[PDB]
Structures are given as C-alpha cells and as structure tokens.
C-alpha cells in the first residue's frame, strides 16, 4: 500500500510493552496535592486548568480526563510516558487521580503562551524559522518514536515568545505508526487535515504531520491565518486543490488507488496549480524567500509519502540561519 519513508519500523523493533497501550498500568499519584487557580480551555474530552503544586508551590497545568474513554487514557499517557524528555514536547510532570472519585488527570508543566492569532501577525523571518525549527524538533523526536500526533495546528503550538520557549501539547489524538496499519481518517483540525484525510485514504503515516506543519508554515510566512479555510471537509479539499491544482489531485489519487465520494465531482471544479510566489504582496514580502518556497513547496504536496521528513526539513537551507545562531 503506502509505508512511512522513515521510522517504519520502530516500534516493531521495539519491545512489545512500549506501544502495547492497552496493557500499560499507569501510577496515579493523589490529585489533591493540586490547587486549581484558572480554566484555560476546554474539550470534548478534557478541561484544562492552570494551578498550583501545593507541596512545592511549583506552577502547574492540569488536564482532567473524561473517565469514560479508558483506551484513549492509557494511549495518551503511555505515549506521554515516552516522550519524556524530548526536545519541545510538553513534559507529563504526573498522572493523578481524585482520590475519591477516581478521575484521572495529566499534570503538566507550565507555559505562559502568547496568543497565536496576534503573535502570528508580528513574526519576523527569523522568528518564523526558529519556531519551525523547533516544533520539528518536536516532530522529528516524536516521529522518531513511532509516534504519529496527528493534531497539528497553532492551538497546539505553544510559544512563549518572551523567553522563546516552544511546546507540543494536547496528545490526545495521537497514535503509533504500524506499518499497512488503517487509521481513522477522523483526526486533526478540518484546516490542518492532510489530503489523505479528506479523500478517505487510511494507510497514512508521520507525514500528515508534515501537511500540518506546511499548513502553519504557509499561514506564518504569507500572514493568511488559517492558509486553507474550508467550510467543512468537503470544501477543505476544494481549497487545496484550487492552489496545488485538480489534475495533480487526480494523479494522487491514481497512484495510491483512492476511491473519491462522488459528491466532490459537483464541486472540485477545474483548477491549474498555482505559483507560490502568487500569495506575496506588499504585507508580507519581507517574510517570504525562494528558500521558504521551496521547502513550502516541498511539504504542501499532495503524495504524503514524497513530502519532506521533519529531518528532511530540518536541514533545509531555510534554517540555515537558526543553525548557525545556534552554534555561534
Ligand atoms: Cl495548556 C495544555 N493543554 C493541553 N491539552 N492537552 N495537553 C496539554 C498540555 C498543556 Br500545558
Ligand atoms: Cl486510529
């Protein structure tokens, strides 16, 4: 069918007990050493709250979970627990229960976020090339443990723009990459879902993550927040094609065998590939480089599998410059 290029086979090599989530027996700690000082969000399956270790006055988020859900707890966690200490990944301080009722809630380590929206609007070229750089990092350490996350977007992005801290959160969507394994196509943002995504195809890998990533790429250098903004998944498609072009989705699909819902013949239309160089204008020129086209051009593709590994993009000449900034 379609295999990931890199990390195929990782977990495979692996010990069966490392992505075997199922069978993981978390350690829940007692929640009540937990202080709860403010709502910072709320989902279908969490609530999310800033508060204070009351034992050690450290500074904290707290994640409680809808109990119900218990395979999807114990994947999170599990994939939490391997993660740690990877380069920008949030850090899983614990995992506590209320020791009455028994709910289970994920203890992270604090950051204090700058809004996207109006961040995203005063990023210089350098600042969009270093916090790429560092979300894949993130990518690349998380891929490199068979992990796909499959929720990539700003709202997951965290940055602390004042100390230059980044950080990839909210795992709750994130799977392990097996080889022909079928995934639900039912995973990330309608504006951050890959093609494969919206035409059904679930023989996906680690590169939906690197649409994703393209997505907020696109978005920070031409200043269009979101870049592809579908009305539902239907016309999510219809976007993209009307940039990347209809006969290149044609042949996507014929190479990988992909069956369309017929409703798309109504209203994909007839759409040439268009050039990047066709978002410049005057408020954002001095964001935009034939560098960052070409790695643009280069992760907004189609074919998952001929986008660009978050190692590949990593050693694009685009970051060049945070590279050397890093060593000098
Ligand atoms: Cl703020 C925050 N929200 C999350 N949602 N899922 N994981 C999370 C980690 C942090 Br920190
Ligand atoms: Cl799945």
Same mark, same amino acid.
């Given at each position: 069918?379609?295999?990931? /290029?890199?990390?195929?086979?990782?977990n495979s090599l692996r010990s069966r007990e490392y992505w075997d989530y199922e069978a993981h027996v978390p350690?829940?700690?007692?929640?009540?050493?937990?202080?709860?000082? /403010?709502?910072?969000?709320?989902?279908?399956?969490? @609530?999310?709250? =800033?508060?204070?270790?009351?034992?050690?006055? =450290?500074?904290?988020?707290?994640?409680?979970?809808? &109990?119900?859900?218990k395979k999807?707890?114990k994947r999170?966690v599990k994939i939490?627990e391997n993660? %740690?200490?990877?380069?920008?990944?949030?850090?899983?301080?614990?995992?506590?229960?209320?020791?009455?009722?028994?709910?289970?809630? !994920?203890?992270?380590?604090?950051?204090?976020?700058?809004?996207?929206?109006?961040?995203?609007?005063?990023?210089?070229?350098?600042?969009? $090339?270093?916090?790429?750089?560092?979300?894949?990092?993130?990518?690349?350490?998380?891929?490199?443990?068979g992990i796909?996350?499959?929720?990539?977007?700003?709202?997951?992005?965290?940055?602390?723009?004042?100390?230059?801290?980044? /950080?990839?959160?909210?795992?709750?969507?994130?799977e392990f990459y097996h080889?022909?394994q =079928?995934?639900?196509?039912?995973?990330?943002?309608?504006?951050?879902?890959? &093609?494969?995504?919206?035409?059904?195809?679930?023989?996906?890998?680690?590169?939906?993550?690197?649409?994703?990533?393209?997505?907020?790429?696109?978005?920070?250098?031409?200043?269009? =927040?979101?870049?592809?903004?579908?009305?539902?998944?239907?016309?999510?498609?219809? %976007?993209?094609?009307?940039?990347?072009?209809?006969?290149?989705?044609?042949?996507? *699909?014929?190479?990988?065998?992909?069956? !369309?819902?017929?409703?798309?013949?109504?209203?994909?239309?007839?759409?040439?590939?268009? %050039?990047?160089?066709?978002?410049?204008?005057?408020?954002? %020129?001095?964001?935009?480089?034939? @560098?960052?086209?070409?790695?643009?051009?280069?992760?907004? $593709?189609?074919?998952?599998?001929?986008? *660009?590994?978050?190692?590949?993009?990593?050693?694009? &000449?685009?970051?060049?410059?945070?590279?050397?900034?890093?060593?000098?």
């Amino acid at each position: 069918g379609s295999r990931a /290029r890199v990390y195929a086979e990782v977990n495979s090599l692996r010990s069966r007990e490392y992505w075997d989530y199922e069978a993981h027996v978390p350690s829940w700690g007692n929640q009540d050493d937990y202080q709860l000082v /403010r709502k910072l969000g709320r989902g279908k399956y969490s @609530e999310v709250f =800033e508060a204070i270790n009351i034992t050690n006055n =450290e500074r904290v988020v707290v994640k409680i979970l809808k &109990p119900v859900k218990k395979k999807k707890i114990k994947r999170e966690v599990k994939i939490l627990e391997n993660l %740690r200490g990877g380069t920008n990944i949030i850090k899983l301080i614990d995992t506590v229960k209320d020791p009455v009722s028994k709910t289970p809630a !994920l203890v992270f380590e604090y950051i204090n976020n700058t809004d996207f929206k109006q961040l995203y609007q005063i990023l210089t070229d350098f600042d969009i $090339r270093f916090y790429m750089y560092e979300l894949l990092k993130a990518l690349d350490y998380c891929h490199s443990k068979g992990i796909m996350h499959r929720d990539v977007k700003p709202h997951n992005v965290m940055i602390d723009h004042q100390q230059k801290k980044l /950080r990839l959160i909210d795992w709750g969507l994130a799977e392990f990459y097996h080889p022909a394994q =079928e995934y639900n196509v039912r995973v990330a943002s309608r504006y951050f879902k890959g &093609p494969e995504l919206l035409v059904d195809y679930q023989m996906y890998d680690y590169s939906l993550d690197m649409w994703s990533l393209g997505c907020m790429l696109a978005s920070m250098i031409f200043r269009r =927040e979101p870049f592809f903004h579908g009305q539902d998944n239907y016309d999510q498609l219809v %976007r993209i094609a009307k940039v990347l072009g209809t006969e290149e989705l044609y042949g996507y *699909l014929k190479k990988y065998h992909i069956d !369309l819902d017929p409703h798309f013949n109504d209203i994909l239309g007839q759409h040439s590939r268009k %050039r990047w160089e066709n978002f410049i204008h005057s408020e954002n %020129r001095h964001l935009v480089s034939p @560098e960052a086209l070409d790695l643009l051009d280069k992760l907004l $593709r189609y074919d998952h599998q001929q986008r *660009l590994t978050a190692k590949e993009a990593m050693e694009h &000449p685009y970051f060049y410059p945070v590279v050397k900034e890093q060593s000098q």
